[PDB]
Curated annotation (Swiss-Prot), chain A:
Subcellular location: Cell membrane
Similarity section: Belongs to the tumor necrosis factor family.
From-to range in the entire protein, with total length: 51 to 173 of 173
Record protein name field: Tumor necrosis factor ligand superfamily member 18
Gene symbol of the encoding locus: Tnfsf18
Biological source species: Mus musculus
Described purpose of this protein according to its UniProt entry: Cytokine that binds to TNFRSF18/AITR/GITR. Regulates T-cell responses. Can function as costimulator and lower the threshold for T-cell activation and T-cell proliferation. Important for interactions between activated T-lymphocytes and endothelial cells. Mediates activation of NF-kappa-B. Triggers increased phosphorylation of STAT1 and up-regulates expression of VCAM1 and ICAM1. Promotes leukocyte adhesion to endothelial cells. Regulates migration of monocytes from the splenic reservoir to sites of inflammation.
GO molecular function list: cytokine activity; identical protein binding; tumor necrosis factor receptor binding; tumor necrosis factor receptor superfamily binding
């Protein structure tokens, strides 16, 4: 049972244990997958109000883009269900760091349980 | 340990157990929350390509909790992750509403919830 959540406001990860078995976390908000499996990558990137300012966020897996999101400076949930392999680095890239409200912005992963049963 | 995933293509829920303790599910893809707690609501809504949409109705998805709007999402007909971490209470219902059902590609569109473990350790 393995879940981590990075809070951009404090730059700290909140975690299910001191040394989650499924992932290593970095203070720069990156992570490295230790256990191959099905993961839910998740998070909300909250933009600042436009009066202060394209709003773009990418999720990377190693050196390749896993997901690209864009909108007109509105709340942006990120992620989805992915098959990840031990060794994979997962991290976010922003178009402009200044677009991002740190308060309330967060992201993370959870190793998923199997879902064998149907409706 | 309690997670459910609704696949719009089959209209079936895939679940951690035959009868998840934390929710009841409906065959039209709605949830009733049975256990108060911290949940991660998740999913991806895949829109039909904008080139095929011949008017100017926007692509909008909302998640409702009872009769409160939990979140409203819009983009220019691109893949749309949804959800986040929310405190839900016993008795809450959760469901989605789309601005137009015909904007939605059934294949690969899915959503669901997972009862979250406590995250007491900070580093």
């Amino acid at each position: 049972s393995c879940m981590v959540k990075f809070e951009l406001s404090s730059s700290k990860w909140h975690m299910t244990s001191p040394k989650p078995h499924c992932v290593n976390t970095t203070s720069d908000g990156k992570l490295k997958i230790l256990q191959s499996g099905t993961y839910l990558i998740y998070g909300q990137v909250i933009p600042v109000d436009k009066k202060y300012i394209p709003f773009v966020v990418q999720i990377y897996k190693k050196n390749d883009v896993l997901q690209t999101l864009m909108n007109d400076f509105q709340i942006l949930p990120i992620g989805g269900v992915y098959e990840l392999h031990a060794g994979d680095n997962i991290y976010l890239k922003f178009n402009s760091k200044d677009h991002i409200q740190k308060t309330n912005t967060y992201w993370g992963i959870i190793l998923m349980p199997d879902l064998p049963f149907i409706s």
